[PDB]
Subunit: 114 residues, 3 copies
């Protein structure tokens, strides 16, 4: 799985251990080994949500399977919770795009997961 967070929150406001927490929590939530989890946080972005520049986040979670109605609701609760607690971003100013990737469309280690 791959989780990316783009936010206007300042780099200094991202707490130590944030990437490790995301990795652990996502491994738990998706049921995939943490060794396969990639996380990426991009602070200090020029963005607006609803026409406002208050703290917000635009994210994406890509996974080969483990994507669906109920699972995505669970992921959203978990991730919005983390963003709210760690980055002080209101859940209603967070968008998370979920992508169910086909194994043949994910490259890794000179080949794909097909």
């Amino acid at each position: 799985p791959m989780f990316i967070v783009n936010t206007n929150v300042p780099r200094a406001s991202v707490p130590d251990g944030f990437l490790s927490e995301l990795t652990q929590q996502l491994a738990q939530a998706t049921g995939k080994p943490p060794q396969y989890i990639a996380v990426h946080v991009v602070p200090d972005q020029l963005m607006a949500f609803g026409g406002s520049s208050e703290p917000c986040a635009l994210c994406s979670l890509h996974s080969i399977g483990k994507i669906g109605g109920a699972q995505n609701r669970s992921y959203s609760k978990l991730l919005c919770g983390l963003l709210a607690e760690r980055l002080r971003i209101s859940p209603d100013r967070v968008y998370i795009n979920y992508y169910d990737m086909n194994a043949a469309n994910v490259g890794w280690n000179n080949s794909t997961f097909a």
Copy 2:
């Protein structure tokens, strides 16, 4: 809707009010309330288009519905026009990927839009 623009144009060349203009124009074009529109501009990027480092932009527009042949052509005219007028980027050096998202695959406020 979520609109992201990545460009090699310098931050200083992005006019004040650009995010607000994108928000307003997108609300009008998509027919959705501005409160749901998210915009993200990323300047000073290391990119090339056609092998050239002249001004260019790689963008994406994600929306739950309101994506299709005719609509996308209209979105492209609007957005390329704005990029040309505000950032001085030639329309033929702009790529905009459109994504019609399923409500179940968009997280927001601790849940999804499903």
Copy 3:
């Protein structure tokens, strides 16, 4: 085609000519005219792969067609090879998401490719 690479490798470690090499190699691999190839490299990123902050890369390749099982394996060999040789990133710390875009969903020059 559009290729984007996000990495924690420092800007200074990206060799001169890297964007041109990616452009030429992608033109060759996809069979697409070089003038239609867009490349974007984003260094100095805050990311982790498998919980580790050792050099890694999260990438994406979007193309209208020319995406499939065998082709993606070939693209992965090519791109991981380039990332390993030029940025010193181990192939097993690279993820590349492949997207087969519909011509109607790609905007360019005030319209789409439909």
